[PDB]
Design a protein around this nucleic acid. Structure first.
Ligand SMILES: [Zn+2]
Ligand SMILES: [Zn+2]
Ligand SMILES: [Zn+2]
Lengths: 107, 266, 1451, 57, 101
DNA sequence: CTACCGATAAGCAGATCTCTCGATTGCGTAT
DNA sequence: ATACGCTCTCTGCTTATCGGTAG
RNA sequence: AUCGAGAGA
């Protein structure tokens, strides 16, 4: 995990994804002064493991593409360090049913 | 309608015996519901009823030009004085009797004389019923027009509502079964509905359905044409059920150079 | 559709493709050569006999007449290939960005290979692999690149093999919406990368550019002198169709590798090479004669427009062919070139002409113009939206509707005119000949009868022109054994008339919701030419009986009969899915009749009571459940028996409610208070007990469309049928009662007493001076000032000039005069009335809710009040007079539109004029609003038409994409959610509810322990926790709805339902114990679940569209447009709410608002004086500010900040504007140091200063060259002063402190910038800030915060207009919108990522989505409802969600 | 058969509208008695209609 | 040819078996949905109006939909509802197996 | 020192219930 | 005289020329 | 067939 106070030069961004399997994630001193998971609009996101993801797909007889999709670049996926292909779990505070469990896949 | 915007269609011709009759023996020829008044607030119709009854009794004509009365000299007061002088009641109420049972009603009914207009919006130019009739040429759907024996249109919003009921069979019967249902011919391999034809027969043979796209220029599997072009080719065609507008759309797309393959299931 | 001719085959799917020139030349019947249609058809012409039979001419292809000839296609041979208008843009894009020398793209070959590999991976469901291929950059020169490409190819092959082995994808590929989005993004980036190239990379050979001038014309430009310099080391013009075809053919046959994946979305089994000849039209296919028959209108014979365009193409083609022979003379013979040059220029002109003729035949916007083949399939009048998404139908009728209360509330009255024309195919049998033979004997004319008798072999004999004896003979031979073996499995049909047992579907346009089209029962009446409809359906259809008309569709098969009688029928739609409220009931006469019948004052003798009971209830019609009418003991025994109206209600319930069930126990209220019946009355409190009305009056709130009334309660406890029967019985009862005790209204109802009139006069005498007082308050003048004071008149003149001040004055005066109006009405109604309730029928209608309201009563009887126009008072002319009668600037309420007049006594001419203004405005607004919300419903429903409920209890789109895992979070049907939190009602009616639910038959098919145990564990954990915020809590237990199916496990309920049930059982301990009540409520929750196959998307779209018609931040339809129609990132009023800490005083909050809100430089400027002197053209721009102790207080801006902004930004912007205008016209030592610094920093500032001790002036001299012309130097200075900011925070326009509503203290800022408010944590609860802007919250908080914002906003539009829309609809809408992680919209932009293209092309821009679907060879499996109806297949939602199998008893 | 209105403005004579009788005078009872005329519909006496009331061509 | 059709048929039937869900593990509603009831009534009415053998005793009625409703009341409808899962899997519930309301 | 990617001013494509009646290309041209 | 050759609306996507950063 | 006027909810 890397942070930068003000800016990052564009040339230092073409080689971060060039060293697999390790990954580098870049954040800023700005946009991190407030944790965006403490916001009442933002539910609790739980990163689903491989076994639970397989159980979910078998339960719903789904395909990884058909699930609701969370972008790779929205703040929650950056916050969790989510990877493409791995499903997240959202506990929604529905005003008609209280707690409600829904899952989004990162693609 | 009266002269106050109180329009309304006529429901039933109520027989005079079943009509309510007043104490003087007169049955009204127009019955208007009292519930039409509170929302519109056409008090001019009440005032006209009062003045019409008073004028019919006294043999005079009552002028209804706006702004001839005021708060101090109310038309209700004026026409009530005239009615009371004539012997009827001040408020225009007449004690009436039920025409079906005969007993006097709970309260005095408000009667009077108002001027009524008959509008040209008659039901004899509105009703229309279709069972079959003239269909269109290209879509083979019912034509448009009341005088043409034409059907009515179940449109986009009607289709969307018919889906919302979950009645997919209602949708089928409306948009396909009763509009442009056809048992066309489709080529199994080509997947095309238009490039098929009814082959001409020989002496004793029976006409069959063949295809032109999957056929090449030339004993048992030889089928001829009307123009003499006999050749062996597509002998594997089925019959599916489609709208005819689908066939017209296929022809139009073929005019654009676009092909649609129809994958027949079995 | 005959059901006696089954169809075996079925269209599984349709895939778009390109019609090549070879197959059309193979399939065609004949070629069309001469452009002459008729002399009789021209042999070789457009109407040739090989293209179909034509006017008794047997077709020369199949030898059949016009009836049995399907029509065959022909082709016209184009002499040269032509640019297909559909694909011209792709042709042009591929022509550009290519090397004419090496015949490869000007992009790096390795990059092209990378794109090809990524596309090959995306052809399968391998998005992750196609992104892990990017990190194989070498790595790990030509040999290195070849090895890298081999590595990438082997990686792709291994990934695809692994996916195929492990099951994630089959050999056909996995194409979904997200893989489609990825493929489209990749192809778009590939094309953009191609077109942004200057020099070829495989061989650095510069290629000439190209230019575009519409269509049919492509030209290339020559390289420059410096560009050919590289062309001198590497060693305008009109290009031809054949030249560009050869170029692109070479390029495509070289780059097949990448093209097989660019022009494909799924793998191609046949491996057919993608060829460039598919982009050119060298052959045109002509539609058959059947589809190009002449448009003949009597003697008005017209040629078909397609024939016109084809003939023009033929003329140009023959002209080119002839030009190709004489040009041969000037080439074989050694002739001069001038004539040859003329012939060649003519040939080029003819090429352009034939290209334009082809473009005209295909399209009409590229060639008043004749509509081509593209315009026939384009818009609302196009083929799709007018002949596939809406059609004309047989077996339907239309007429004017008239009321009828003597018909069942679930029935329709059909005249004999319809009843003899409409007919139904009833196949004869051994159990049906009793009535069908009778109908055949009756014939087409005597209802009920048979118009036609369909034989076994499909022959349709007609009985219209037939005699009675022949009809009897046919009916005797109607049921006969089949003599032919090939037709021994069929029975004759009878097209009998529409009886009383048949079912019919009604509809009244506009069909804003599904309730506006129901399936009624047929009742054949004896009078003609009007459709009879009960009064219960008026609310459902929004119908009326002042000329309204509605359609009557007659289903023709027992499947549609069952669908209409069970699913679409009238009594199963008692409750609207929009909010679960009832929509059926009685309206006006029945409501007033019930108010009069169910009072204490009503008594009935034995004969009267029995007559009313038998009038309403009729056992011989099935209205009674006991086969014998049962009555009650009279409420009075001596002196003589007397019943009561409430006893009539009790007897009605006693006879229609089924026996062996307890009576209804309901406690409710009505609309009429207890002060309208006298002192000590309790008739406002309705009270039922064992089905006996013991107190209160029946009102609009009980029978009608009202929740928790007696009819709604009867519905809940006894099913829909009993509520329908109760509505019918009450309709008959209140009709027969109103006949004998008729209801009336008159002049005496509208009169006040002498005391009432004196009260009204006394109060209205205080309205003379309210306008003057309000004007004095608005103009900041002390009270008791005369109405004609000169200063007051001047201020009123200023207010008249200024629109905002005019609005302020209107608001203040309107408030005061409305207070006076309220005083008058509350004083004079009902105390001052002459005739009083219940005798006063006007007030009876107002209070009872039958018609009108207290507003209408007050307008009739007290006064009309202020006339409001466009939210203001009456308009005022430029002279200050609002009317010629009133003197200028008349400070009087009557002048401004305050009508102190009533419709009982009449209004003056001026008030009449003002009231006409108001009425005209109202009529205009209603006319606009009737269809201002028509586009929204279709925009929603096009995308949501497939979203349904699956058997997994997860709602998901038609293709299979999952939208939500559980409908609303709890899978509760909205139409069944009504009596779930009504725990007191359920406890009171426990025994009847138990009887209706029957847990005796609901035990062996349920698991009743595991769900309960898990729910107990989860509740215990939640009770232990939940004193901590939502992010910090660890879940450790998903809600029970996640694990256990709510429709299979008893006790699996939502967290809110369980909490409410436990709170009820804990707060009231009341003979049935809590255990059985809890079990019953959980079973009710199980039985209140939304069925699999529900069209939840359609329902949500309709329930958010239809209520919209009922309609400083945008509201209503504009806001619904911003949110759900286009999803604008820049909304008209972007706001974000800022919660405050409870330790911050309101003074501190206001100071924070001032210090955060922006302040321009122009907001501290008093005046600017520009002393221009040319004695070298100078300016002395003196700036005058307000007093410091004024502007610092107002804006928190001080002398130092003012000097800083002037020195840095204002002077800079002034110099920039001055120099731009100049260029346009061509075509104390500290103060000294500051002045010198500013002079040096800026261009032509000569002097500078500032009031450093008072901040009152800023005078700086400016100078310019003498050669410059004259400048305004006031307009530009004013614009700069407007532009320059003193203190602003980006995107924030103004922060204000509204009054604390809902208790919480919040601030609202104009403009959204989340990361800028995170820094003010000392004043703002930074974790609670929410915004209007969905895009901003999506960007800085994530998809789910955007989902919450969408739901809250799309709910805030309805909830401001007091409209209730269930959150399940809004949640479904928002989860369909953010289904890709982005704030998509409901339009064609957001529609592009979709599996089915039939849906998009039916929506709009049909040509574009057709080209996209044919380039990618898209194959849609006919999943969306639009595709099903385009191909005519049974829909998937609803009753098509499954299949029906027959259990034959033999293997 | 049209009739001059009993209730008419003074401008009815000035424009000579008697030459063009628009409608007819009728005895109208404001009564809720039939139940067939609730929303906006109205009830016409059958006997009056059988005596040429409101007839037109 | 014949062998190509044989392998096509084998692949089709194998896919069918791989999609079917056995009776011992179906997780759908035990009840009969309103759509299922309506379509089963309509289809049974079609069948009986097409001269099918009937099991219940006719009470003089002649409406095929009414006869189908009588059969559904007597649980004598020989039909099977094939509830389709989103991915093509199907559970074959029987009319008698389901509980009507 | 020039290639490539943003970034605002300009250009370009598009939808917003039923039913009557009335009207319908201008010249030119060679016999 | 006649037949026949022909000037007073709303959005949102897409294109063009000026800004830099970097090998 | 197209564009103009009007009408009903
Ligand atoms: Zn074929
Ligand atoms: Zn033919
Ligand atoms: Zn090259």
């Amino acid at each position: 995990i890397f942070v930068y106070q003000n800016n990052i030069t564009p040339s230092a961004m073409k080689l971060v994804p060039s060293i697999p399997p390790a990954t580098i994630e870049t954040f800023n001193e700005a946009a991190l002064v407030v944790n965006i998971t403490h916001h009442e609009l933002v539910p609790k996101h739980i990163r689903l493991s491989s076994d639970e993801k397989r159980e979910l797909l078998k339960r719903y007889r789904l395909k990884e593409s058909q699930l609701p999709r969370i972008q790779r670049a929205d703040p929650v996926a950056l916050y969790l360090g989510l990877k493409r292909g791995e499903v997240v779990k959202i506990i929604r505070k529905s005003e008609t049913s209280g707690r409600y469990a829904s899952y989004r896949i990162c693609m | 309608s009266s002269r106050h915007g109180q329009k309304g269609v006529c429901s039933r011709k109520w027989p005079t015996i079943d009509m309510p009759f007043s104490e003087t023996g007169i049955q009204p020829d127009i019955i208007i519901n009292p519930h039409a008044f509170p929302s519109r607030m056409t008090i001019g119709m009440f005032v006209e009823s009062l003045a019409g009854k008073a004028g019919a009794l006294h043999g005079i004509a009552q002028d209804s030009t706006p702004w001839i009365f005021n708060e101090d000299d109310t038309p209700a007061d004026y026409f009530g004085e005239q009615l009371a002088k004539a012997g009827y009641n001040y408020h225009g109420n007449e004690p009436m009797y039920s025409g079906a049972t005969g007993e006097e009603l709970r309260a005095d009914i408000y009667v009077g004389v108002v001027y009524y207009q008959r509008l040209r919006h008659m039901v004899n130019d509105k009703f229309q019923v279709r069972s079959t009739g003239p269909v269109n040429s290209l879509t083979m759907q019912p034509v448009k027009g009341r005088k043409r024996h034409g059907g009515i249109r179940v449109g986009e919003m009607e289709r969307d509502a018919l889906i919302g009921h979950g009645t997919s069979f209602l949708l089928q019967d409306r948009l396909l079964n009763s509009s442009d249902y056809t048992q066309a011919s489709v080529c199994r391999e080509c997947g095309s509905i238009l490039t098929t034809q009814q082959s001409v027969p020989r002496i004793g043979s029976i006409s069959t359905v063949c295809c032109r796209r999957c056929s090449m220029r030339f004993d048992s599997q030889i089928w001829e044409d009307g123009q003499g072009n006999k050749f062996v080719g597509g002998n594997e065609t089925t019959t599916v059920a489609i709208p005819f507008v689908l066939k017209y759309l296929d022809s139009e797309l073929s005019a654009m150079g676009i092909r649609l393959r129809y994958n027949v299931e079995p | 559709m005959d059901i006696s001719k089954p169809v075996g085959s079925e269209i599984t799917s349709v895939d778009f493709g390109i019609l090549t020139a070879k197959e059309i030349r193979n399939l065609s019947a004949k070629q069309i050569t001469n452009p002459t249609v008729l002399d009789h058809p021209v042999s070789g012409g457009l109407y040739d006999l090989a293209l179909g039979a034509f006017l008794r001419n047997l077709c020369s292809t199949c030898g059949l007449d016009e009836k049995f000839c399907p029509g065959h296609q022909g082709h016209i041979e184009l002499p040269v290939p032509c640019y297909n208008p559909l694909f011209f843009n792709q042709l042009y894009i591929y022509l550009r960005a290519s090397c004419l020398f090496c015949h490869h793209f000007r992009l790096k070959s390795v990059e092209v290979h990378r794109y090809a590999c990524k596309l090959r991976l995306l052809q399968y469901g391998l998005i992750d692999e196609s992104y892990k291929l990017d990190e194989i950059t070498l790595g790990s020169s030509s040999t290195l690149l070849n090895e890298l490409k081999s590595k990438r190819s082997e990686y792709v092959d291994m990934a695809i093999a692994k996916a195929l082995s492990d099951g994630r994808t089959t050999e056909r590929g996995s194409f979904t919406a997200t893989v489609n989005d990825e493929r489209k993004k990749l192809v778009h980036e590939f094309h953009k990368k191609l077109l942004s190239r200057g020099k070829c990379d495989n061989c650095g050979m510069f290629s000439p550019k190209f230019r575009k001038d519409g269509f049919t014309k492509i030209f290339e430009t020559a390289l420059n002198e410096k560009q050919i310099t590289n062309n001198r080391v590497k060693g305008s013009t009109y290009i031809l169709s054949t030249e560009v075809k050869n170029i692109l053919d070479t390029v495509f046959r070289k780059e097949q590798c990448v093209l097989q994946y660019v022009f494909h979305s799924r793998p191609n089994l046949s491996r057919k090479l993608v060829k460039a000849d598919s982009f050119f039209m060298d052959v045109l296919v002509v539609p058959p004669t059947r589809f190009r028959l002449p448009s003949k209108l009597g003697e008005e014979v017209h040629e078909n427009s397609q024939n016109q365009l084809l003939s023009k193409v033929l003329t140009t083609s023959l002209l080119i062919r002839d030009l190709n022979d004489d040009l041969s003379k000037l080439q074989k013979d050694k002739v001069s070139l001038e004539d040859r040059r003329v012939i060649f220029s003519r040939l080029m002109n003819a090429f352009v002409t034939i290209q334009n003729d082809v473009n005209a035949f295909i399209d009409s916007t590229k060639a008043v113009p004749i509509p081509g083949v593209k315009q026939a399939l384009e818009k609302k009048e196009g083929l799709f939206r007018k002949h596939m998404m809406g059609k004309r139908v047989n077996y339907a009728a239309r007429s004017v509707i008239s009321p009828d209360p003597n018909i069942e509330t679930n029935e329709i009255g059909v005249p004999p005119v319809f009843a003899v024309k409409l007919t139904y195919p009833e196949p004869v049998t051994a159990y049906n000949i009793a009535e069908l033979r009778q109908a055949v004997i009756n014939g087409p004319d005597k209802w009920p009868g048979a118009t036609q008798i369909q034989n076994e072999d499909g022959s349709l004999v007609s009985l219209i022109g037939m005699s009675v004896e022949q009809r009897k003979a046919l009916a005797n031979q109607l049921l006969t054994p089949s003599s032919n073996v090939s037709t021994h499995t069929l029975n004759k049909k009878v097209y009998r008339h529409i009886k009383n047992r048949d079912v019919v579907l009604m509809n009244r346009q506009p069909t804003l919701h599904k309730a506006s089209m129901m399936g009624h029962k047929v009742r054949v009446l004896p009078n003609e030419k009007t459709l009879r409809l009960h009064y219960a359906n008026t609310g459902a259809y929004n119908a009326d009986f002042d000329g309204d008309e509605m359609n009557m569709h007659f289903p023709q098969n027992e499947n549609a009969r069952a669908e209409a009688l069970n699913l679409a029928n009238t009594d199963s739609q008692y409750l609207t899915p929009t909010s679960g409220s009832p929509v059926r009931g009685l309206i006006q006469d029945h409501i007033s009749a019930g108010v009069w019948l169910t009072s204490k004052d009503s008594f009935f003798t034995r004969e009267q009571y029995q007559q009313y009971i038998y009038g309403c209830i009729r056992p011989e019609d099935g209205h009674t459940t006991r086969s014998k009418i049962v009555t009650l003991p009279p409420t009075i025994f001596k002196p003589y028996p007397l019943w009561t109206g409430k006893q009539i209600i009790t007897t009605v319930l006693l006879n229609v409610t089924p026996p062996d069930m307890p009576g209804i126990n309901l406690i409710s209220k009505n609309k009429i208070k207890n002060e309208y019946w006298g002192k000590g009355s309790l008739e406002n409190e309705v009270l039922f007990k064992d089905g006996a009305l013991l107190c209160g009056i029946l009102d609009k709130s009980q029978y009608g469309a009202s929740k928790y009334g007696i009819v709604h309660s009867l519905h809940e406890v006894y099913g829909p049928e009993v509520a329908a029967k109760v509505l019918s019985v009450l309709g008959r009862l209140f009709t027969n009662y109103i006949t004998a005790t008729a209801f009336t209204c008159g002049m005496d109802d509208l009169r006040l007493t002498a005391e009432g009139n004196k009260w009204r006069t006394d109060i209205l005498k205080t309205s003379v001076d309210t306008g003057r007082e309000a004007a004095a308050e608005v103009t900041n003048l002390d009270k008791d000032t005369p109405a004609d004071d000169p200063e007051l008149l001047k201020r009123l003149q200023e207010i008249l000039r200024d629109n905002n001040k005019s609005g302020i004055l209107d608001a203040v005066t309107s408030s005061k005069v409305n207070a006076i109006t309220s005083q008058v009405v509350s004083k004079c109604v009902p105390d001052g009335t002459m005739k009083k309730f219940p005798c006063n029928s006007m007030q009876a209608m107002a209070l009872s809710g039958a018609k009108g309201s207290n507003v209408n009563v007050s307008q009739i009887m007290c006064l009309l009040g202020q006339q409001a126009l466009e939210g203001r008072r009456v308009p005022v002319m430029v002279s200050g007079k609002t009317l010629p009668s009133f003197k200028p600037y008349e400070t009087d309420a009557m002048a401004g539109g305050y009508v102190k007049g009533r419709f009982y006594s009449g209004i003056k001419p001026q008030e009449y004029y003002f009231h006409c203004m108001a009425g005209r405005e109202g009529l205009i607004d209603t006319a606009v609003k009737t269809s201002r919300s028509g586009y929204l419903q279709r925009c929603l429903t096009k995308q949501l038409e497939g979203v349904h409920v699956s058997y997994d209890n997860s709602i998901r789109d038609a293709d299979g994409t999952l939208v939500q895992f559980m409908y609303g979070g709890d899978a509760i049907d909205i139409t069944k959610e009504s009596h779930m939190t009504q725990f007191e009602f359920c406890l009171d009616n426990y025994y009847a509810l138990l009887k209706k639910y029957n847990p005796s038959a609901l035990i062996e098919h349920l698991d009743v322990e595991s769900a309960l145990k898990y729910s107990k564990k989860t509740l215990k954990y939640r009770k232990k926790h939940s004193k901590e915020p939502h992010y910090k809590q660890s879940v450790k237990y998903d809600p029970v709805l996640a694990k256990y199916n709510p429709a299979k496990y008893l006790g699996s309920v939502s967290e809110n339902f369980q909490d409410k049930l436990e709170s009820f059982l804990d707060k009231n301990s009341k003979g049935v114990n809590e255990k059985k009540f809890r079990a019953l409520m959980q079973l009710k929750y199980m039985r209140s679940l939304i069925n699999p196959g529900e069209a939840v998307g359609i329902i949500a779209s309709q329930s958010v569209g239809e209520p919209s018609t009922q309609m400083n931040v945008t509201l209503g339809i504009p806001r619904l447009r911003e949110i759900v129609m286009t999803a604008s990132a820049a909304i008209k009023t972007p706001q974000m709410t800022l919660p405050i800490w409870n330790d911050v005083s309101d003074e501190q909050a206001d100071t924070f608002c001032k210090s955060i809100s922006k302040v321009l430089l122009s907001e501290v400027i008093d005046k600017v004086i520009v002393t221009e002197t040319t004695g070298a053209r100078s300016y002395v721009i003196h700036m005058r500010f307000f007093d410091n102790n004024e502007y610092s207080e107002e804006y928190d801006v001080s002398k130092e900040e003012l000097q800083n902004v002037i020195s840095n930004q204002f002077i800079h912007l002034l110099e920039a504007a001055i120099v731009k205008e100049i260029k346009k016209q061509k075509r104390n030592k500290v103060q000294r140091d500051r002045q010198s610094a500013i002079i040096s920093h800026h261009r032509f500032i000569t002097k500078y200063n500032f009031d450093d001790e008072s901040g009152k002036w800023c005078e700086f001299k400016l100078e310019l060259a003498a050669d410059t012309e004259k400048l305004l130097m006031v307009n530009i200075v004013e614009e700069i002063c407007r532009k320059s900011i003193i203190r602003q925070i980006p995107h924030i326009d103004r922060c204000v402190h509204p009054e604390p509503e809902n208790g919480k203290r919040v601030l609202v800022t104009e403009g959204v910038n989340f990361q800028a408010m995170w820094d003010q944590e000392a004043f703002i609860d930074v974790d609670g800030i929410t915004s209007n802007d969905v895009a901003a919250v999506l960007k800085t908080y994530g998809v789910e915060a955007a989902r919450n914002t969408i739901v809250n906003e799309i709910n805030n539009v309805f909830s401001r207009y007091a409209i209730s829309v269930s959150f399940r609809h809004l949640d479904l809408i928002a989860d369909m919108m953010t289904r890709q992680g982005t704030y998509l919209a409901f339009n064609r932009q957001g529609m592009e990522t979709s599996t089915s293209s039939f849906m998009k092309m039916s929506y709009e821009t049909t040509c574009q989505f057709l080209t996209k679907a044919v380039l990618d060879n898209e194959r849609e499996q006919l999943d969306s409802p639009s595709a099903r109806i385009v191909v005519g297949k049974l829909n998937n939602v609803g009753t098509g969600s499954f299949d029906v199998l027959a259990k034959v008893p033999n293997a | 058969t049209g009739q001059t209105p009993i209730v008419k403005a003074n401008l009815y004579d000035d424009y000579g509208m008697d030459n063009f009788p628009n409608g007819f005078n009728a005895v109208v009872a404001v009564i809720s008695y039939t139940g067939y005329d609730m929303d906006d519909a109205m009830i016409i006496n059958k006997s009056a209609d059988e005596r040429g009331f409101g007839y037109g061509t | 040819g014949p062998e190509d059709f044989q392998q096509h048929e084998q692949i089709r039937r194998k896919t069918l078996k791989e999609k079917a869900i056995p009776k011992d593990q179906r997780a759908t509603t035990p009840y009969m949905t309103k759509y299922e009831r309506a379509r089963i009534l309509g289809t049974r009415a079609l069948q009986i109006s097409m001269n099918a053998p009937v099991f219940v005793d006719l009470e003089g009625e002649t409406d095929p939909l009414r006869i189908a409703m009588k059969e559904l009341a007597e649980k004598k409808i020989p039909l099977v509802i094939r509830r389709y899962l989103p991915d093509g899997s199907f559970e074959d519930w029987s009319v008698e197996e389901l509980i009507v309301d």
